[PDB]
Each structure stands twice: as C-alpha cells, then as structure tokens.
Amino acid sequence: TGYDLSNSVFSPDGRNFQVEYAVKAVENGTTSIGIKCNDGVVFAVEKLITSKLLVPQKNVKIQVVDRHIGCVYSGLIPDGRHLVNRGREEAASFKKLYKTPIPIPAFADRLGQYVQAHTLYNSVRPFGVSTIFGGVDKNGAHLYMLEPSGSYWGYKGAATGKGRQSAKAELEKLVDHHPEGLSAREAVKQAAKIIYLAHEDNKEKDFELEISWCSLSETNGLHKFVKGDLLQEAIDFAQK
Amino acid sequence: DPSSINGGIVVAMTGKDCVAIACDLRLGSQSLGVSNKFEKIFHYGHVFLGITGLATDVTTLNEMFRYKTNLYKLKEERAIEPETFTQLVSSSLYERRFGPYFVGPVVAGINSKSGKPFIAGFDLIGCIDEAKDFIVSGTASDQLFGMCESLYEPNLEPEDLFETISQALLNAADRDALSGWGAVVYIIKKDEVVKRYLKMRQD
Amino acid sequence: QFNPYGDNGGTILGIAGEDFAVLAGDTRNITDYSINSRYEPKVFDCGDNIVMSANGFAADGDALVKRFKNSVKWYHFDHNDKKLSINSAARNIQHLLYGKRFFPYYVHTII
Amino acid sequence: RGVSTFSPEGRLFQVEYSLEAIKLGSTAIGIATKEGVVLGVEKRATSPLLESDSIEKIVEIDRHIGCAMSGLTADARSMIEHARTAAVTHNLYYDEDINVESLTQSVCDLALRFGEGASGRLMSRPFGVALLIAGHDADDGYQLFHAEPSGTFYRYNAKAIGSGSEGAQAELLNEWHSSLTLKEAELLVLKILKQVMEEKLDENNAQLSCITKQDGFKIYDNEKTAELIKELKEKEA
Amino acid sequence: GSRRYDSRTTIFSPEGRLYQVEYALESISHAGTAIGIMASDGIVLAAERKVTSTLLEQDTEKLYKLNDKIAVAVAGLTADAEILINTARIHAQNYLKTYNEDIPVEILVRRLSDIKQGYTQHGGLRPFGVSFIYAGYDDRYGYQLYTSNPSGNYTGWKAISVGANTSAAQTLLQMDYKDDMKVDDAIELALKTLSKTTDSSALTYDRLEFATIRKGANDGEVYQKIFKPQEIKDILVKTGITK
Amino acid sequence: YDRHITIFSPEGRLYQVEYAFKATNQTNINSLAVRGKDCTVVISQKKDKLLDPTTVSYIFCISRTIGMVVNGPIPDARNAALRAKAEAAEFRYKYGYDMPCDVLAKRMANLSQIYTQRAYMRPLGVILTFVSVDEELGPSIYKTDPAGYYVGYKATATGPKQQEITTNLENHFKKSDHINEWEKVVEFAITHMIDALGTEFSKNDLEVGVATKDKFFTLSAENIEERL
Amino acid sequence: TDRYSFSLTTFSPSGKLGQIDYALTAVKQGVTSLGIKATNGVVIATEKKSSSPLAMSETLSKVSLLTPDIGAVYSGMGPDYRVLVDKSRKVAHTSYKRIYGEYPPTKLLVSEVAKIMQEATQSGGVRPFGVSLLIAGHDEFNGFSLYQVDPSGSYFPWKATAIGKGSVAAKTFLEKRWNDELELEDAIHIALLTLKESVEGEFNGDTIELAIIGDENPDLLGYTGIPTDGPRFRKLTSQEINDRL
Amino acid sequence: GYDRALSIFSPDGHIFQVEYALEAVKRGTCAVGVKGKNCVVLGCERRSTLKLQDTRITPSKVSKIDSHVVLSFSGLNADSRILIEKARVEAQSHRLTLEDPVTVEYLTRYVAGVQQRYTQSGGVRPFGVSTLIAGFDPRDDEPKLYQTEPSGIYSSWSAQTIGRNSKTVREFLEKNYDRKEPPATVEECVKLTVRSLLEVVQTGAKNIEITVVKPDSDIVALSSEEINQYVTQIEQEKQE
Amino acid sequence: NNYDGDTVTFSPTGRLFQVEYALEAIKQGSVTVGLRSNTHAVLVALKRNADELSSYQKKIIKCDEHMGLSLAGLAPDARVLSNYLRQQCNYSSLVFNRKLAVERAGHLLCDKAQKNTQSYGGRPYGVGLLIIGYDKSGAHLLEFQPSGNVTELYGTAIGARSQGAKTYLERTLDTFIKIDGNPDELIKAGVEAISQSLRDESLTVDNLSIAIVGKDTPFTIYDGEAVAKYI
C-alpha cells in the first residue's frame, strides 16, 4: 500500500516495490541478447525505426568499456549510458592502480555494487535498465547479466527486454543442441536469427539489427562491431 | 631566546610537613628594569604555581589554569590536588608541542587527604620532574642548583626552611643580571600560609 | 630551485599612424646561444582588427594570447556580437595580467 | 511537491504563483520613443500619515539605465543591487557602458537562481516582483524591457504592469505610435495612470522619470509633474 | 526524499504562534515546582522534588551552580538543562578570562536566552523543554532574580515560581510579600507557599531542595549555601512545617 | 509512518527491522554450520539451463582464515562481503595480526545497529554466519542479524526449514559441545541436512566451505561428489 | 543524500515526547536487572537469556567493565547497549584519563553517558537509545555509588533499584529489605533472592550474571612493583554463583 | 544542514509565513511613534503582568542602537533582541569604515534587508517583529521616523503605531495629527503620545513608557512620575 | 496520482511523470524544423510574441562557429544547455585544437540531462532542442529530449503541430537529401516544411528565423529583412 512510494522501504513481506517498478520499466524496452561461445562473447540488439527520417547505421546502442568489454542494455537508455560511464571510470581506475585490464568478474562486481548502492536510500532512484555485458580476460570468456536490484549472474546465454521469453526459449534450445559449444561466427548468425525471431512479437515497426563480438581467435581478445560481409551473411541467415 | 627576555627565578623546597615556594619580582625588557612588582606565584585553592619566562606567557597560563581549575571544581564538587594539577599542567603544555609556551612552571602544594607535601617542575613542553628536595627554574637556574645542593637539609622546620630558601634565592639572584628587584616567599602548612617580602639590594 | 621562467629573446615594435597602425616583430627564437627556430611568428591578429604581441618568455606569451582570443570569443557571445574596440581590449588585457599579480606572466605586451 | 515541481500542464507552480503575486502590485507604465523612454508609477499610500516621498518605485541602475518595479517590492532590492554591481563591474572590466539587453539578461540569470544557475541555489523561492528596465545604448538606441521571475524578458514599445495592467495595456495598444514625442509620451503615461488609479491623480500619488541620451536617467520633481498634470487637464478639458 | 517525515518545528501557526514552544511550556507545566524569592539582603531558591520520590533514593537534580555568585533552579527535562548549564559555566569562565572580572548576571541570562531562541527560529530541531530561575549577585544592581522559558524570553522578578502550580504559587506570593523582607522571612514565605501548593500528604525534607545566596557565613562578600537534607529538616522544624 | 523508517512504534518495536528479517527468507535456501574441534564446516543448499552454475554461490572468503555464509538477497550479501573484506584488511594493517572471527562479527553487528538507529540508512536484509579456527579459541561460528544482534554457536542453521535442522542438532548434542571426528565432519553435516530435509542432494545441490587452522576454502562439485 | 537534518523527536500537543516514551516501553519489555549498594561494595545483577539452545551464552555478557572501578548493566535493546558501552569507554579515556592521568569518578562518567543519550533525542535523523543503564562504581573521594540512566538522559543515584519486566515487584522487595547497614555478602544474597522471583526458567550459574564493586584485587593486576598500583570491579564466575546458591 | 523552503508561494500568490508573522506582530504589545517640530517621541505599553516584576533589570523595549538612533518594536521579544544586536554591530562597522555615524534611513534599510533575507532564505522562519526606528541624522536637525515590517518593507511616516489595537490609535492619530502644524515643543508631542496610548491602555499610567529623542544625541527616558503627571493632566482636562 | 511528486519515484507501470510533464511543456512550444543535406544543415523557426507591442522571442542560439541549435519549450533551460555546450566546444578547441563532433555534444547533453531525473532536489529540463552542425564527417542534425534521448536524423520538427512538417519531411526525403551546393534551395525546402504546421498565421519577416551551417559556411542566423526573400 504505502510501502511503494519511497525507495529503500521494506514492505511487510520483505519487498522493495520501487525496484519492481524499475523492472517494469525494463520490460518495456527492446530485446538485447548475449551469447557465450567457445572463445568469446557475442552481443546483439534490435533498434526500432520509429521514423524513416532516422539516419541508418547511426544511433549506436552497443557500447565498449576499456578495449575488451562489451555492454548492451534494455530499458531507459540514458540510465544505461550513465552506468557505462561509471564502468569506464572503474576500469580506468583499476588499470591505473594495477597495470592490467580489469578482469570481467571484478568489473561485474563493481557495476553490481554501484547499482545496489542506489537501492539503499530514498533520495535516489533505482536504475531502470537490465544490462548484458562481458568480454575476454586471462581466464577466458565471461558473460554476465545485471538487474535493477543490483543482482547479477554469469550466463551461458542471456536475454532481456520485451521479447525476452522467445529469446530465452531460442537460447535454451541453442544450448541444448550444442553441448560442445559454438564458434564466434556461428554465434553471430544465431544471434541474428534469435533477434529476428524475437522481433516477431512487435510487428508494428521495422527494426535494425546491431551485432558486436569479442573473441580470442577472431578479434585477438578485443571488442569489435560486425559491419562488413559477415553482418550481411548473418542477416540473410536470419531472414532465411 | 624568548625565555631569557623578561628574566625571573622561582624556587621550591619541602620541609617537614610543610612546603615553601619563592620568586623574584623583576620584570625587564632586555636590560632596562620595567617593574619591580611582577609576582610569578599564583594559587588555585591550596595548590601553588610559579612560572618563569615570557611575561605574556606567564599571564596567559595563569588565566588558563584559573579557568580550568574553576571548571574542575564546578564539575567535581571538590578542589583539585597538586598531583592531579601536575598532570593537567603537563597535558596543557604538551598540547602546544610545536608552538610551545616559553615557560618554566613549578608546582608546590600539600595533599589534603594525605598531608604529604608535593613538589614538581616542568620544561616548556610538559616533561614532569618530581623531586623530594627542591625544584628551581629561571635564568639563574645554575646558581639556584649550586645554592640548593649545599644549603638544603632533608627535614627542616618551617622557620628553618624559610631561612634556607630565602638565602638560596637571594644569593642566586645577586649573581644574575636579569633577576632580582625584590623577592617573595610563601611558607605553606596544612592550615596556614604565610607570605613574606624580603629586603634586597635592588640593582 | 626550479626557475619556472625563461627568456627566449625577440624584439617587437609598434607604431601608430594617422589612419593606420603597424606591429612588427622578429621571427627568431633562442634559448641562450642556440637557435630554436628561425621562423616562429610572435605577432597575431586577435580578431576585430586588433593585433597583439607578447614578447619575452614564450610560454607565458602564448598563454596570454590564447586567453585574450578566448576573451574576444566570449565578449562576442555575451554582447550580441558587438565589436571589441581597442581601449576595451587594453582594459581587458590589464585585468588578465593583474589576475596573476603574484605569479606574473614574464612578457612585455603591445597591441 | 517541492519548489521545482512540474504541473501536469508543463509549468512550474512557484513561478505561476509568483506571477499571481505580481498581479496584486501597484501599476507601473513604460513608454519608449525616439527621444527617450518614460517610466511612471503610482504611489499607493496606505495611510494619510505615510510620507509619500519615502515611497521609491523608480530607481537608477546606471546613468543610462533606470528601472521600475511592481509586486513584492522588498524582493527588488537584491536584484537592483545585482544590476548596479553588474553595470559598474562591466565599466571596470571594459571601460565602456554596458548594453541594456546584457544587463537585463544578467538580471534574469539572477532571477533563475532559485534553481540551477545559468552557468551551472541562492534562494528558496522565486522573486515576487516584475521589472521594467529602460535604457539607452549606442548599438540599439532607446530600449524598454519587461523582466519576470521566470527568467524570461521581452522588449516592448510600451508596457504596463501591476493591478491595472490589462486595461492600461489595452489603452497602450490603441495609443502608441512610432512618431510620439517625449512630452506626448509623458502626457499619455499620466492619462493612463489617471484612468487606472482608484484615487484622484495628483503630484503625490504618482511620479514620472525619463531616460535620454543627453541627460541620462532622471526622476521628475513634484512641481514638474504637477505642471504636467495641469497641462493634461487643460488639454483634455 | 525525507520531506514527508519533517515536522517543521520552526514555523508559525495561522494565529502567529509557535506550536513547539507552546507544547514545551505545557510539558514544563507538569514538572516539580521551583520558587525564587529576593529579599533586601539575599536570595532564596526552593525546588519541590516531584519525580523519583522513593525511600531507596539516595540524595547524594533541580538546583545547580553556575559560578561562585550565580545559581539556577531547573524545571523540565534534566539533561537539556545540564547541556545549557555546562554552556553557561563555560561562558562565565570565558568572561572572567577576557575581562578579569565576574560576569554580570544579566549578560549570562541573555546569552542563554539567545541560545534558546536560536533553536526556535532556525534549524529543524526541537526546542529545549527547560525553564530556568536564575539567582545571582553583581556590583551593578546587587541581588538579581530572573526567569527564562523555551520561548527565549527572560524576565526579572522580585518573586517568581515555575512549574506545576505556578498560578496558585503566584497568587500566594502576590500577598504576604514586602519590599523590606529579610532572608529568613523569604525562607519562611517560600516554605509556606510550597506547603500550600503541594499536592501531597506532607512536605517532608526528602522531597525538597533549598539554596540561599547572602553575605557572610564564613565567606567574603557573597556566599552561596546549598542546604543538606539535615539543614532542610532543621529549617522545616524552625519555620513551623515540622514535616 | 513509524512503519516506513527506523523509529519506535508505540509498543517499542522497529517494524523495518522485522521486515528486513522477513526479507532474509527471499531465497528458499538453508545453510548449516558445525564445529569439529579441529575445523569448521558450512554447507549451503544452492538450487535455469542458461545460468553458469559456477558463478552462483552464497559462500564468501573474507580472508585467509575467515569464511562467511549469507542468508538473504545476493546484492546485500555482496555489499556485506565487500565491507567485511575491507574491515579485515584494515584490521590486519592497523594491528599487525589476523582479524579474529568474533571481532569481525561484532564490527558487522555494530554497522547493522547503526543502520537500525539512523533514519537515512536502511537495514540490510541478510543474516551473516562467520566461521573460522581462531588461534586463541579454536573452531568458531558466529552469527549476526539485521537487528544488530550477534552470538557464537556450537552449531547453527539458517533458512525457512531451520527448525527441523536445529531440533536434529539439539537431539544429537543431547545424545552426545562439538563433533568428535574435516571430511568426516563434512559427511556428518551432509547426512544431517539430508535427514532434516529429505531426498538425495547431488553434487550440484550443495556448496561446502571448510575452515582449518590456517585456511578457509570451498570444495568443488567433484569434491562434493567424492563426499557422496 | 542524507537529508534527515530535522529532529525525529518532537513535543506532542500534550507536552510529551513520544519517542522517549516508546523507548521507555521497550525498556520495560526487557529482562530484569538489579543493583544494590552495601556499606563496603555494590552488587549488579541480571538474568542471562539465550536466543537458541545451540548458542554459547558465555560469549555474550550483559555486564561490562567500563573502568577498573566502574561497571554497568542494562535492560532493553542489546546492540544499543553494546554501542553505548564502547562509546562510554572511549569517552572515559579521551575526556578524563588523557587529561588528568586518572580514571574519572563514577558520577562524571555517568554524566558523559547521559550527555551521549540526550544528544540522540534532539539531533536530526536519529532514534533515541532504547535502553536503561545501571552503573556501579567506586572513587576515592565519594566512595561507592550506583546510578540509573534513562533513554532521555536523566540519571538518578539509587541505594537499590531494578529495571525490566519485574521492576515493580523487585523494587517493593528491595524496599522491604533495606537497613543502611548491609555488607557485600548480604547484598549479594538479597540480589540472588530477588532474582529468584523474576526468573521463570532454570535458576543457576549459567542463567545469572553478577558483578561487584568491592575491594582492590592485586591478583587481577598483572604486574608488581608500584605500591600505589586496584581493579575493584570483579565478575563472579558461574562456579561461585552455584556455590552461593 | 537544514535548508527546507519554509516561506513559499500559495496558489493565490501569498506567502503564508509572512502573514502569520504579521499576526504575531498583532499579538504583541502596542508601540507608537510621533514626530515633533524638533523631537521624536516613542511610547510603549507595558504588559499587565504580575506585580512581582522587577522594573530595574527587565528589558525596556526601547533600545538605543546608537547615541543618536533608537529602536522600539512589537512582536516577539527575543527576535527583536537579535535584530537590535545586528543593528548595533552594523552601526559600529559603518562608523568605523566611513568615519561617520549612520543615518536613520541607512539603519532602517539595513534592518529591513535582514528581515527580507530571512523571508527569502531557506531553513529559517521570518521574524515575527515590526519595528519603529527614530532619530536625527548627524549634524542634521530634521526628525526622522521609520517603520519596518516582517516582509522587509519600510517607510518614513509622520506618526505610526504597531501592535494589538493599533487601528484605534492610528485613527486617533489621523484625527488629531496635523501635517501642516506638527506639535512645536517636546511637551506637546509627549502629551499627544500619551493621549494616543490612553485610548487602548485603560489599566492605568503605570504601564506606559515614554522616550524623547532630540538632535545632537539627546535621548531621555522619562520617569514614571513625569508620565503620571502627564496622565493626570490629561484626565483633568478630559472633563473640564 | 501519488507517484508524480518527484523525479525519483517510479509508477507501478514504471513511468516517470515529471519527465512526461516536461515533455508536455515541450509540446506547447512554437514549431521548429531541422533539415540537412550532404553539404549543409538548416534550422527554421517560427517565433512568438506576447502581443503587438512586444518583440518576438528568439529561438536560435549559436554554440560555435560550426554548430548551433533551436529550442522549443522553456527558454531558460535552453540557455543553460546552450551555455554548457559552448563551454564544452571551447574546452575541446582550447585543449586539443579540435572541433567538437556533433555526436559527442549530443552525448554530453544526454549525460547532463540524465543526472536531473535520478536524484532528489532537481527537476528535469523543460525544453527540446534541434542541433545542427558541420564537422569532419559532414553535416549533422540531432534531436534532444529532456529524458536524455538524443537521435540523429535527416530531418525533424518539434513543438506544437509539428506532425504536419514531419510528414512533409518524410514524404520528400529523397529530394532534400541531394540538395548539395545550393543553400537557398535547402532553406526554401525547410520553409515549405514549416509551412505545413501553420493554421491561422502566415510567415512574415517578424516571426521567421533561419539558421544555416555548411562545408564552407559558418553557422549564420538570418532574421528580419534577411529572410524576406524566403517568404
């Protein structure tokens, strides 16, 4: 009843309703997906073309942290940009202190602490974004998803946004059918296919597909967008 | 040296169930005598304090210790004893470890509960020197040491203690250019305090 | 023991005519007895038909010139693109110089 | 609801309420011609024992800039101090008179300071007073501006503020033309003030001031205003 | 934010009143009675103990000393009163240090009143729920009696009462008071007023605090005496209460 | 109201603290801690194909000797874990010897009490169980709650189904303190949990933390299967 | 972020500070604790309740040494008492011992604790402490003393008193057995008898905590050599309590 | 710190705290000031408090801000003391900086500025005081009177009353005070002030205080005997 | 509605009502249109006046020699944002001898707007902005909303009744895309687009303002007689 009007107020059942409302805000965004392959990660996202006056291939959504971390988010885009700026500051501080690129689990913990710190007071608002991020470090490839409550986990495949249910079903089938794993290019094709399938929930507007990847054998452990013939091949595979 | 600008000397001795504290009266700037009525001895209840050094620092420390002793009496509902006042003086001095007061304080008293005379001296940063015989301070400290190591006896009646401390003070002050324009002696018993002004050559 | 200043040499000259002004400068930059460069201009056109030269320690002079150009830009922004006259520029430069009264620019300025 | 809350229509509550407060003030009229700008105010004395010479609704910001106020006139003193300081500091920094529009923009930036400043909170509420700023500069000649606690200012050929602003402005719409002389502007200001004032107009209930390039800002004495009122009465009847 | 939980302790009412100040006065009106009487040669303070009136209560709470010449009687919260008393003691010592003279009573009273008023005007904190009766001596006016309330107002009185039965005590004190009374007559009047206004079976010695400020009594110019329970019992026997 | 911030109710209660206690049971996971007179053993009941199981854990390594288990939501759990690690490191730097388990528990309980007394701070809806083998006290289990209350235990259990485990432990101790046996203590705790709850916990259904004299570590799934 | 700069404790229209009254209610819901002052000592006693049967109740002590000659006990909220004890020890060191070289008297330390408790009822954004404290001490110039401190910062000196659930009955019992001539053993016996009434479970040495301010204990002073150097405060072991039972 | 906006605007454009401060001024005792040909007279009403009040030590309402300037008030007494202290400090500072004592108008403007600042600043409440400021400018023989209000408005006035039944006294003044021929001697001004005060204060002549201000810093507080003489003369002339 | 008090409160459906109220403030402003080609970028603005005796409110603000914007909504917020953008461009030039890219300025505005919708004590801005510029990548047009969203478009319109102009721009996209080297034609296309949002008024020299930037053209503003040839 009255327990939903302020952040960091426990309900009688032990709930924080402002965080749940932030999750509701997240559920109204576009679909973002991440796939973990044998030696890297692939991030894919759908961008709605509200008007034909939007310049194609501009308005980039996927963002980069340091030179090896990829991040995408669903929800209120400015909140995601705020979180990415904070993550860039954290990575810079870690690199300055310890002369090594920040490991992915450490970056995930720093982001989680920052998100969680916004559920502790009623003078601030929880972040309205769910973030799928990851990359490659000395231990290998890592993929994580972070929720508005500050909780995060590592995933074999993650999906968020309005079309999250169908994307999760497709990811589960993909994981079940490939116990050994997937290559980076095959992961790019599958991400294109899954984004196209998940868009079928929202047929009212056209969409553009954006894909990025970070792999040891394809980008030498750096994060790079997919823009050339590979992007067209993935689009053709998805539309097939 | 700020400590040797104004001049002045203070002595303290223990005799039987009694104590004695004496000081000179001169106040001069560098070599010109300004005042012959500058007393360096104050008392807060039954505890006596004599301060040598910069006259400004002497007055400031007297005012500050009067402040602190009044507040102590208000909170504790009893007068402060010499043994606790010594610790208070040491802490007050060490709180200015780097901007120190250029002072030579000496504490003399009789403990109300025990009746034992107590005496102590301090440097400018609050190091405590406890003595069973005597304490000296001022520009004529070496002369005072020479007089006291020869004239003092372990147990003296107040009448004899008066003569001993007075002669030590006068003969040490007559060999110090910056000390001596008058002299005051305090003889302190359990229930009586006597103050005497000595006759001196002035110059 | 650091000596944040230098000399850098150079010579400038300003002459005012009946309907014109002239500001001339040497183009030689030296440290003590070596030549840093033979063509390093020290006279600049700082907008609104105003020319400026701050001769002496080169770093301080460059900083002062950059600050004055920025001041002209903000004067245009804040006053509806009004032309900055020469006396107003002189006063603004006086304030810029006196803003470092106790750590001054080591230059002689002519506009 | 804080002091910086948006209404569902897209407006700030405190600014609208301050405008309502301004609507309760006494009437001030400004008229701009090519021979100078005229400002005029009514002196709303509460009691017969109140000495009207102590009521000062028209103040000088600089030799070439004057101002009149309406509403909570106590709040205007801080803004007047700010404007005088801005003009004097501009003269110090640039050896030139400040433009009227720049001074008005500085005053509006100050008025914004119940929230975020113009360059990135000095008070807990917006001002409750509106200003008529008259001036002359070499770039734009004679100018009249209306400044409001919303941080927005306008330029007017003629403007009226205060309790009787609507009727006075309606009269100004039908009576202002670009060929008005200074004396005609003075008579028009007096006539509109007499129309909007409940009390009978005289040399004590109202005062006039003028800004010219030659003589600068000046406030008329009571004798000159009385002569002008007599001239207006004779001309009208 | 936290705007909902703010009670706005420093705002006016539509009638021009401060709610917190009035409520603190009402809180004080339920505390033990204190009375101050000034005669031509001294001052008497008498505080009737109200709380913690039990047999196993060691006397070892209402009368306090500020300096060697000024004392106070407290009505209200004891801990807030102790805070203000510590501040007043520090102020008196600061004045002595600066000017090498004893602080006049009015200056200290006005300083305490200003401290009280500050909590009423600015900040978001509750006012002090304490009323003080000051009894002091100075070379300007001689013997002085003051009172100060949470509103920050201080007033000088010949005879005053603060506490549970201020109306009845003041009505009693308006009569039977003369400008030429002595210290013993003032003591008798204070005890009689306390006995008449007491809402208890008897006015015993263990429910009272007494203090006098006069001249002499094994002291110099001015002596402050805080009565022991035995002295209070002897005074009660002498006056006629015999309780 | 008094039910939104940490102020007293008319009955002297603090509703936000009680609601945080309720929040401590958001995850239906039970944990059990026992002592073996030479070691300390904690076992937790971790329970989607998309998740990476190795990243899911409620057992933290606060320092070389101190281990922690949390009951409650994972964000507050990680908040507390980071705070405890920082406190232990600061203690070791400042005082020159390893932080003991009981002192760390007291420090965390003091922080929780601060949360319960300050309005702008909300309590953390977690229950913290610290285990170690102290060089002065031997095996040690200490537990702190959102109210600021902490105590040491011979053995303890946390979760929704904690009454059954507590009753079974008390019956075992009455039969007869500690366990007189680290692997044997681990198997004892596994069997105790199985008997208290039911079914057969596979290697993926539990996580085990073991604290020995100079170390605290966590067993892998292969080690847990080896116990089974 | 922290915008709670306003008092959470305010006067009601009737003149009552509600939060302090609620803290007093929380105290009155707490377990019983007692203090008795004899001619040659002071006894402070309390009941030890265990949250769980598997909890080592020895690790939690409701009686705490403040100074070698001053100890304390409480009724109310445990964590508040723990924090208050830490603060009281720190204030004892930083306000008196570092200035005069001696531990403070009982009354001055009680006054400092009362100041700390009062500040929590007027400063912004805080809740008053929900405890009541009994403090027992000895000093050279005042002898033995016992004090009670309330959540509002009011403190009173007591010949004997009790706080907690069974406060009224224990107070009546102690009133009926006061004679101004008791010794330490008599006070300990009276305290045990009064506690036996207010304890519902087992009444032994593992469910009672007793402490005494008595005579100096040279054995509890890990060095020899200074004639003027004693810790009067002493906590009775469970074995001694069982023997006295 | 505490910086809540206590004084804000209402939907009708009013600031309620200022109006309530004006009501607080209304609750205060009645003060009056009159201008003479060469003097200013300030009259105040004493509250009918208990007869056990000591007149020597109680504050006497009329306070000398400087040897040539006095101030009286109506409203809360302690707030008035704060304003009086600020005015005295400012007068000394001005005399220091400009080598001349303040004018009456300058001090009035300073006090009004303090009141306005409290009306506009955050975390404080406005003063519940209205003030009358009287005096003579240095080397000037022109009487000066001014009134200041909680909002910050000030004006000069030839005769003015504040507090409680100030309307009746103001009507009496308007009926009896002539601008063309103000009272010539000090006695006439004192008589007018006393007669105006007697219109609301029927509790006797004991509760009336009179202060006379004359140029070259001539400030005299009349004794109770003189005020009683004036009152007896007025009573005698009342009937015949 | 109890959820619209401040900007730190979500609704049960996950909406920020103060942001929506700021958007409503935008929707009541005068229409402005932005357009661009591969070589030039253009802003067209319809001014408004209080009454006949009043001047018209300015709507176009120059940020730097290669960049400017037009506003719709609360003008002081536009002044604050424009001053911030001027400072950022000046910093880029002073420190790197570099002309700030349009996309980076959009990012900066997004970041500055986001911080005002997540913390207590501050309101979101109440203005929408159309930003034109020319940099090393050519001509750019951006649309900024106070929620923090910034979009890059070929053309757009904001303010009251901007839908007609937006539809006109969407229909004639391929035409104005290729108006390279002919600034007057692009300006006339923009004027025709803004003519679609007029209902009871006609464009005059007093209520029409135009701005243009381009490959060789610094950001320039035309008003008054300077627009008489475009009417």
Numbering used by the authors:
A (entry chain U): 6 to 245
B (entry chain X): 3 to 205
C (entry chain 1): 1 to 111
D (entry chain S): 10 to 129, 132 to 248
E (entry chain Q): 2 to 61, 64 to 246
F (entry chain O): 12 to 58, 61 to 189, 192 to 196, 199 to 245
G (entry chain P): 2 to 230, 232 to 247
H (entry chain R): 3 to 242
Authors' text:
The 26S proteasome is composed of a 20S catalytic core particle (CP), to the ends of which two 19S regulatory particles (RPs) are attached. The cylindrical shape is formed by four stacked heptameric rings, with the two inner ones composed of β-subunits and two outer ones of α-subunits. The multicatalytic properties of this proteolytic machine are provided by the subunits β1, β2, and β5. All active CP subunits are initially synthesized in a precursor form with N-terminal propeptides (β1pro, β2pro, and β5pro) that are autocatalytically processed upon CP formation.
To understand how the pre1-1/β4-S142F mutation affects CP assembly, we solved the structure of the uncapped 20S pre1−1CP. The resulting pre1−1CP structure was resolved to 2.0 Å when C2 symmetry was applied during reconstruction. The proteolytically active subunits in this structure are all autocatalytically cleaved, and the active sites are arranged similar to the structure of the wt yeast CP. No chaperones or propeptide remnants are visible in the pre1−1CP structure. The overall structural effect of the β4-S142F mutation is minimal. The β4-S142F mutation is located at the interface between β4 and β5′ of the opposite ring. The phenylalanine is sandwiched between helix H3 in β4 and H3 in β5′, which prevents helix H4, the S3/S4 β-hairpin loop (residues 18–34), and the H4/S9 loop (residues 172–177) in β4 from taking the wt positions in the pre1-1 complex. In the pre1−1CP structure, the S3/S4 β-hairpins of β3 and β5 assume the same position as seen in crystal structures of wt CP, whereas the hairpin of β4 is distorted and located near the central β-sheet of β5. We conclude that the pre1-1/β4-S142F mutation prevents β4 from reaching the correct fold in the mature pre1−1CP, despite being located at the β4/β5′ interface and not near the disordered S3/S4 β-hairpin. The folding problems at the β4/β4′ interface also result in an offset of the two 15S halves by ∼2.5 Å.
